[PDB]
Design a protein around this ligand. Structure first.
Ligand SMILES: N#Cc1cccc(Cn2cc(NC(=O)c3[nH]nc4ccccc34)cn2)c1
Length: 246
């Protein structure tokens, strides 16, 4: 669907990413929206439209939804549904010390449900992190930006070979982000240092709020070889097993 600039009311500025500015607005003085205006030079306008085109044909309750595309006036923008609490990364940083391990695991499950859908759809995310996840009504997590050495798997570090298994490693890191309440993976480590530690066999430490079982799954996502990593469909059942038990 096509949206006119006159149909949008820019209320306030709510974020600035590498690819553009995000605003809180209204469409047709009705629906509360998030307007993603393009950043010139950061990416081609064609790729900005294609990103949204792909997303509009992927329907899952745990993936962000668009209202449409506003192309008439530059800066060109994407009109998404509003996610009240914003990015998971920011929502974890503030609200830190208030989360329970039952809530945090439920967030991983929300993302895994979404990721298992994209996996079946043969769609590779390539940048799955807490910053690319959005918190909405009743703390539901939705995946966004489905059109970063700290989230990269060894195949990505040295050979740039992305797969659903590359996203599995990323999800393992996203899990650490979630159970660390927004903390940065490999805190004061350089890109060269992250590659060296992982290549030697080292991995992110067990976060305080995570159980031994949670870390067991994290380490299953962090297997050097991608064939020894579970698919998101297997991963989803693994997390649910601990969700109902203890
Ligand atoms: N009401 C309100 C309100 C006013 C100011 C800030 C906030 C918190 N906040 C919410 C967001 N939401 C988003 O950024 C957001 N929502 N859907 C999105 C889709 C794509 C990218 C970003 C999106 C960001 N900050 C909420």
């Amino acid at each position: 669907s096509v949206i006119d600039p006159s149909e949008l009311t820019f209320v306030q500025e709510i974020g600035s990413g590498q690819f553009g500015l995000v605003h809180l607005g209204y469409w047709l003085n009705k629906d509360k929206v998030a307007i993603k205006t393009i950043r010139e030079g950061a990416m081609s306008e064609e790729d900005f439209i294609e990103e949204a085109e792909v997303m509009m044909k992927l329907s899952h309750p745990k993936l962000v939804q668009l209202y449409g595309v506003c192309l008439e006036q530059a800066p060109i923008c994407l009109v998404f549904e509003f996610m009240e609490h914003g990015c998971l990364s920011d929502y974890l940083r503030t609200q830190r010390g208030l989360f329970a391990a039952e809530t945090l695991l439920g967030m991983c499950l929300d993302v895994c449900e979404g990721m298992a859908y994209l996996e079946e759809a043969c769609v590779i995310h390539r940048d799955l992190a807490a910053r690319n996840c959005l918190v909405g009504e009743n703390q539901v997590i939705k995946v966004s930006d489905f059109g970063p050495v700290k989230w990269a798997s060894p195949e990505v570090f040295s050979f740039s070979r992305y797969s659903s298994k590359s996203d599995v490693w990323s999800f393992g890191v996203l899990m650490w982000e979630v159970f660390s309440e927004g903390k940065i993976p490999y805190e004061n480590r350089s890109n060269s240092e992250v590659v060296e530690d992982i290549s030697t066999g080292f991995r992110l430490y067990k976060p305080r709020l995570a159980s031994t079982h949670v870390y067991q799954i994290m380490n299953h996502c962090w297997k050097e070889r991608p064939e020894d990593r579970p698919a998101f469909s297997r991963l989803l059942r693994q997390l649910a097993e601990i969700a109902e038990s203890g």
